[PDB]
Amino acid sequence: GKIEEGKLVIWINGDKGYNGLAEVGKKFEKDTGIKVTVEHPDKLEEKFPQVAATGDGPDIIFWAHDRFGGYAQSGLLAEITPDKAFQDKLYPFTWDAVRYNGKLIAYPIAVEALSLIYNKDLLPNPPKTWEEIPALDKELKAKGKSALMFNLQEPYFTWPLIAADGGYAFKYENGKYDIKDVGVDNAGAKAGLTFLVDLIKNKHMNADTDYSIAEAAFNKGETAMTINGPWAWSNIDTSKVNYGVTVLPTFKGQPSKPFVGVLSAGINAASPNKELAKEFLENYLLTDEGLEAVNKDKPLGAVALKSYEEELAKDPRIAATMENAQKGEIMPNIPQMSAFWYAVRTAVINAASGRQTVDEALKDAQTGSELYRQSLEIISRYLREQATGAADTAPMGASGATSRKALETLRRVGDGVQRNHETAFQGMLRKLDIKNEDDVKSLSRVMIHVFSDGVTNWGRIVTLISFGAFVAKHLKTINQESCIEPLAESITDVLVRTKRDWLVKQRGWDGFVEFFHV
Numbered sequence: 362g363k364i365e366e367g368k369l370v371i372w373i374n375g376d377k378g379y380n381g382l383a384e385v386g387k388k389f390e391k392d393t394g395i396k397v398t399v400e401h402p403d404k405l406e407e408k409f410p411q412v413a414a415t416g417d418g419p420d421i422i423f424w425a426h427d428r429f430g431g432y433a434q435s436g437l438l439a440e441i442t443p444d445k446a447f448q449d450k451l452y453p454f455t456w457d458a459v460r461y462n463g464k465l466i467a468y469p470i471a472v473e474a475l476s477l478i479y480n481k482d483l484l485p486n487p488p489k490t491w492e493e494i495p496a497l498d499k500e501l502k503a504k505g506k507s508a509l510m511f512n513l514q515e516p517y518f519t520w521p522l523i524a525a526d527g528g529y530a531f532k533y534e535n536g537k538y539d540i541k542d543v544g545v546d547n548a549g550a551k552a553g554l555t556f557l558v559d560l561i562k563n564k565h566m567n568a569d570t571d572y573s574i575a576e577a578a579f580n581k582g583e584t585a586m587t588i589n590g591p592w593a594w595s596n597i598d599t600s601k602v603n604y605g606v607t608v609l610p611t612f613k614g615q616p617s618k619p620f621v622g623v624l625s626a627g628i629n630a631a632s633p634n635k636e637l638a639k640e641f642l643e644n645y646l647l648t649d650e651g652l653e654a655v656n657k658d659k660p661l662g663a664v665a666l667k668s669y670e671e672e673l674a675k676d677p678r679i680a681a682t683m684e685n686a687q688k689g690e691i692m693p694n695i696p697q698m699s700a701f702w703y704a705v706r707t708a709v710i711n712a713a714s715g716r717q718t719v720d721e722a723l724k725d726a727q728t729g730s731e732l733y734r735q736s737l738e739i740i741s742r743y744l745r746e747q748a749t750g751a752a753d754t755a756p757m758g759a760s761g762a763t764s765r766k767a768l769e770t771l772r773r774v775g776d777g778v779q780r781n782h783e784t785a786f787q788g789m790l791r792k793l794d795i796k797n798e799d800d801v802k803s804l805s806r807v808m809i810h811v812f813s814d815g816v817t818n819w820g821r822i823v824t825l826i827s828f829g830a831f832v833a834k835h836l837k838t839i840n841q842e843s844c845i846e847p848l849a850e851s852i853t854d855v856l857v858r859t860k861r862d863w864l865v866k867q868r869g870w871d872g873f874v875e876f877f878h879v
């Protein structure tokens with residue numbers, strides 16, 4: 362659990378140009394004598410927050426920007442402070458992708474969007490619409506071919522279709538996200554996912570198709586089309602398939618809307634090599650020669666570095682990438698992105714396999730995506746009204762009947778728990794000696810340990826929240842009212858991270874209201 366001083370360890374996904382990145386590392390070593398180790402572990406975006414929370418992990422982590430707000434919120438990333446001269450070398454919108462709570466939390470590398478990739482020897486002109494794909498598959502099947510194969514195991518690849526007719530993650534209006542307004546189970550999301558499931562039902566696609574299977578089929582000339590990003594072009598070049606890269610098909614006359622990623626490089630907050638990491642990223646990697654080395658291995662997309670992007674922009678494949686990007690949306694970096702992706706991943710897989718209907722699958726995904734914010738609304742309101750004696754007059758907003766009814770229920774059962782268990786609550790409050798915001802921050806680890814052990818039920822959830830209210834009352838009394846919202850956030854995090862799957866299975870807070878009815 363200690364990052365080694367005087368070297369650099371870098372993590373990057375196994376679909377990216379990690380051999381090219383290692384070449385940049387060798388150049389760094391030639392100048393400095395500092396060895397750079399590039400690794401591409403499986404599930405690195407899940408491994409990183411686990412290991413970094415213990416003060417371990419790589420010095421530098423590469424991922425699309427969407428994961429980084431969660432990492433930064435968890436205190437796992439160093440703030441990035443490049444000088445004006447350096448900042449001005451990258452496009453401003455790329456810096457925007459790596460800004461979280463007003464601070465830069467990573468270096469942007471390149472802009473990624475999915476495109477339609479097609480075999481010109483099979484399909485001289487690609488389909489403009491999703492709706493024509495079934496007929497094209499029929500035509501191709503008579504030749505011993507298929508129309509389309511792409512990864513159905515990762516929702517990144519299916520999202521463009523889900524979003525086309527009106528699906529959305531978190532609503533964006535007036536230059537701001539409404540994190541309360543989730544668009545996973547609306548008519549538009551349903552229409553797109555139904556189209557996908559119908560392709561499967563009608564044997565135009567197979568629910569088991571993954572990245573490797575689709576890549577192999579396209580590169581062997583068995584399927585006429587795939588959906589993939591710039592990183593895939595190297596292996597297609599090697600295959601000698603006569604390919605094009607183009608705009609994704611429309612659905613119901615509307616563009617497919619890919620979620621656009623900015624490949625980014627963050628520095629681990631626990632690294633003792635922050636200056637070496639900055640030097641590597643700014644003066645080795647984010648140069649024309651550094652990016653070229655990575656790009657020659659696996660293409661990056663539209664790079665963040667203006668000078669190199671000027672050269673690459675003439676490539677029609679990059680132009681197509683950017684056309685698809687302009688039709689899509691830059692991913693949020695809010696901490697709830699991880700949960701959104703987990704929820705949608707499960708929905709797509711379950712709908713595609715027939716384990717759930719489209720309606721069932723997307724209802725669950727909606728609940729899972731809404732879970733943190735709805736839970737926080739309820740728990741924050743209860744803790745604060747308990748502490749102050751007065752309720753919050755603000756409207757509940759989205760799913761407001763559920764929030765209101767859950768709060769009403771919690772008032773009843775939670776007040777009962779605080780009364781009946783006053784002795785244990787008072788004893789434990791005194792033992793914990795919670796005085797300030799640092800002490801509140803220290804609670805998460807012990808709360809997880811206690812709460813995650815043993816049986817799962819709504820009663821224990823009430824105890825968790827009710828003791829929170831008991832602590833909040835204390836905090837207010839000792840003029841530490843500012844600690845209550847951080848406490849609420851911490852409790853909510855514990856609840857939703859430890860009980861996610863069970864909570865979704867209960868219909869979330871609707872289950873709670875029903876469980877304690879009368």
Ligand SMILES: COCCOCCn1nc(C)c2c1CSCc1cc(n(C)n1)CCc1cc(c3ccc(F)cc3c1)OCCCn1c(C(=O)O)c(C)c3c-2c(Cl)ccc31
Nearest residue numbers: 782785786788789792807808811812821824825828829832
């Ligand atoms: C000093 O002994 C007093 C006598 O004790 C009798 C047994 N007895 N009876 C009851 C109802 C509880 C206990 C103590 S053993 C469990 C325990 C609690 C803690 N430790 C270290 N151990 C402290 C760490 C901690 C835990 C939290 C917090 C939640 C909010 C927060 F702001 C801070 C929190 C801080 O939640 C855990 C899940 C909910 N939970 C549960 C549960 O069922 O999960 C129980 C049983 C309790 C008890 C208490 Cl006093 C508080 C919460 C409980």
Ligand SMILES: OC[C@H]1O[C@H](O[C@H]2[C@H](O)[C@@H](O)[C@@H](O)O[C@@H]2CO)[C@H](O)[C@@H](O)[C@@H]1O
Nearest residue numbers: 374376425427428473515516517622702
């Ligand atoms: O499928 C959900 C997944 O989507 C994105 O991951 C992409 C990544 O951005 C690409 O660079 C490439 O590696 O493919 C991944 C999909 O397998 C999100 O960035 C990620 O957080 C999310 O889990």
